[PDB]
Design a protein around this ligand. Structure first.
Ligand SMILES: COc1ccc(Nc2ncnc(-c3cccnc3Nc3cc(NC(=O)c4cccc(C(F)(F)F)c4)ccc3C)n2)cc1
Ligand SMILES: COc1ccc(Nc2ncnc(-c3cccnc3Nc3cc(NC(=O)c4cccc(C(F)(F)F)c4)ccc3C)n2)cc1
Ligand SMILES: [Ca+2]
Ligand SMILES: [Ca+2]
Ligand SMILES: [Ca+2]
Ligand SMILES: [Ca+2]
Ligand SMILES: [Ca+2]
Lengths: 282, 274
């Protein structure tokens, strides 16, 4: 497997803090006794069947911009999942701590590296399905790591076809290639608005009403278009296409001028240095 | 459970024919005939709970379920008329309009029952309509039985919102109303629409084409054609429910199963030929 039962993780890892309490189980800051390496450890009390799925995904997702699995153990009735620690925290928290949105140049770095990560996931037939700023972790170098928390949404014949209703044909066709991946391109567009404006579109509406709103409204656009370049607004226009057939792929959007010339993560390294300096205030 | 482990089914049932495997079975005490599905469990208990809840005149009737000697038994009341699609093959014709009205009436009543219990069939077709010798239907499902009871919303793509909204009330039940409309055409014409296309191309066709209509509209009443027009609405929002369609003049005056009893008598007499 990708899970070790022979080894007790307490022999190798020291729990040195707490991070989150997602309903799944506790999550700790952990320090490696041999190396000093820092990790975030999710510990969960054959219900394991559902949970091994996450580890197989992570194990396949070896890429610079996706969280990096350091290990998985099952020991004394508890499942351990050890990810490399991203000291910068999530982008949404960074915006709360600085009490502002990202500059356009910080959003271009984010966008560029997300597109690269998505191009990788999709070419492996993995769909994220929960993109948002809370799922983008930052390193102190200014690189993202795409993550997923909570009820991890990542993942790889309802009748005889002559009798199938059109809406059932459509919702089955949306579940395989090349339509399924398009959902992430949309959510990416919304994440960019969230990073620009702090809140996603329709944030004022309760969760049930916002579904209606998404289905029936024109695609969202930036609140103050004069703050933003035409490249950003065109990127959104194209990504936030309600039609998944014409919505471009990650590989296509990497050639859009919003991101095609980004060759430096400087702007995002600066953001993380500033967030750290702000956190330090007392 | 709804499954007995105390009782060996061979003590009560005699296998007397073939239809895992599925047998014609005869009750040693009563003489009652049953169709028995025997299987080499989690996936399979779902079917029995559905059947156990679906006590209605026009839905297959569960007589019992046993688990014994590593085998799961599911016993349904035997419907001697067979399935409607097989009847059309044996007679080498479609149903008359009066026979389709009885079928339509009774299917609507069955669907109204299933949907009011939050059960969706999802595989309606003439091959799933069993007939009794009295001329009543029994709605069934065979094969991989299809009967049954995502992200944070601000970031969700419109197509994902739509395909999640189609999975709960009142949109999910609408799929059956469509399939009912296609079943009526299948009974009128023997084959469903687009039967010439391979299964993968037919999906594209269903999504992109206008709704299907009857090949020779002058053979059929305006009530039948209007019923289809209304039931084969591509928009599940405006597609009517089973309860609404029961008030359509195609079926609102049907008070006799005579036409369908005659069909089953004729099919039986045809089968007898040798
Ligand atoms: C309070 O301030 C901080 C500061 C830094 C951090 N840093 C950090 N670094 C790394 N991970 C975490 C983390 C925090 C809370 C919960 N989980 C975390 N990581 C984590 C992620 C996962 N899984 C995934 O991210 C995941 C699962 C399925 C698919 C995918 C993907 F599609 F993206 F590849 C990703 C599994 C186990 C763990 C411990 N947190 C957190 C809070
Ligand atoms: C070859 O000639 C004949 C002539 C008469 C018959 N009659 C007949 N009568 C009753 N059942 C069967 C039958 C034949 C082959 C397979 N299964 C049959 N019935 C059956 C149906 C079920 N389940 C359902 O129909 C079912 C399952 C889930 C949901 C639902 C529904 F949503 F419709 F309620 C229905 C389970 C077990 C069995 C043995 N067959 C069959 C073949
Ligand atoms: Ca690096
Ligand atoms: Ca908020
Ligand atoms: Ca300061
Ligand atoms: Ca055929
Ligand atoms: Ca004859």
């Amino acid at each position: 497997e990708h899970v070790r039962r022979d080894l007790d993780p307490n022999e190798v890892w020291e729990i040195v803090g707490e991070l989150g309490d997602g309903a799944f189980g506790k999550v700790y800051k952990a320090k490696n006794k041999e190396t000093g390496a820092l990790a975030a450890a999710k510990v969960i009390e054959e219900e394991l069947e559902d949970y091994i799925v996450e580890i197989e995904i992570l194990a396949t997702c070896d890429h610079p911009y996706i969280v990096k699995l350091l290990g998985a153990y099952y020991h004394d009735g508890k499942l351990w999942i050890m990810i490399e620690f991203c000291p910068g925290g999530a982008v949404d928290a960074i915006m709360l701590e600085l009490d502002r949105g990202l500059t356009e140049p910080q959003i271009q770095v984010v966008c560029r590296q997300m597109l690269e990560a998505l191009n990788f996931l999709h070419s492996k037939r993995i769909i994220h399905r929960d993109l948002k700023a809370g799922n983008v972790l930052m390193t102190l170098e200014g690189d993202i790591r795409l993550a997923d928390f909570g009820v991890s949404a990542k993942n790889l014949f309802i009748g005889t076809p002559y009798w199938m209703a059109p809406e059932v044909v459509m919702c089955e066709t949306m579940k395989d290639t090349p339509y399924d991946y398009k959902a992430d391109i949309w959510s990416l567009g919304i994440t960019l608005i969230e990073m620009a404006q702090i809140e996603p579109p329709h944030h004022e509406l309760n969760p049930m009403r916002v579904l209606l709103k998404i289905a029936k409204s024109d695609p969202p656009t930036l609140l103050t278009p004069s703050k933003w370049s035409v490249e950003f607004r065109d990127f959104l226009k194209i990504a936030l296409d309600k039609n998944p057939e014409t919505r471009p792929s990650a590989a296509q959007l990497l050639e859009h001028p919003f991101v095609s010339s980004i060759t430096s993560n400087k702007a995002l390294r600066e953001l993380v240095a500033e967030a750290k300096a702000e956190v330090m205030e007392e």
